[PDB]
Amino acid sequence: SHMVGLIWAQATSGVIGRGGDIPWRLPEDQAHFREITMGHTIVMGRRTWDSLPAKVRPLPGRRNVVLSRQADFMASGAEVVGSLEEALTSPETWVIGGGQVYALALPYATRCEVTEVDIGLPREAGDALAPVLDETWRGETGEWRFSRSGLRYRLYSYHRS
Ligand SMILES: Nc1ncnc2c1ncn2[C@@H]1O[C@H](COP(=O)(O)OP(=O)(O)O)[C@@H](O)[C@H]1OP(=O)(O)O
Ligand SMILES: CCc1nc(N)nc(N)c1-c1ccc(Cl)cc1
Helix, strand or coil, rough: CCCEEEEEECCCCEEEEECCCCCCHHHHHHHHHHHHHHCCEEEEHHHHHHCCCCCCCCCCCCCEEEECCCCCCCCCCEEEEECCHHCCCCCCCEEEHHHHHHHHCCCEEEEEEEEECCCCCCCCCCCCCCCCCCCCEEEEECCCCECCCEEEEEEEEECCC
């Protein structure tokens, strides 16, 4: 067990998901997600696993871990753990969602890698929302850049002891 990180992409408001979908199209965030997580362990909740397309899961080049209370759960190509702490035995672990897993994982986390999408989506009932940090987290909020489509985004890299 070692470094636990959270990785997510949010609208400025904190929305990460609405209606079961990512609320924007941003291939550069796909590339950023891949570059942060490749070669490491990724942890997701069972509902997140179930949402992925059958031919996309497990995400290649990473040790995929699915958290579930169901010992019989089938997650072909991944491992299933029944507690989060077991999900963090790896030397470097990125939690990728969803909200229940972020909330369990936040107390272990010492790094967050965030993509802020410049899009105005005030929160609505039902939205999936980003984890909330505080003034004990510190680090770099990067400059805005345009994606190829013109959607603007910037990157946060935060840490704590
Ligand atoms: N404390 C816990 N221990 C074990 N599994 C847990 C857990 N909290 C959440 N989970 C699992 O993680 C699932 C939630 O996945 P998620 O975090 O991707 O969902 P959501 O996106 O809806 O927040 C839960 O339904 C549960 O899986 P099962 O329903 O298969 O048991
Ligand atoms: C590429 C989307 C993405 N972007 C960032 N920045 N973080 C993430 N956690 C995800 C993501 C969420 C759920 C799954 Cl299943 C896979 C990836």
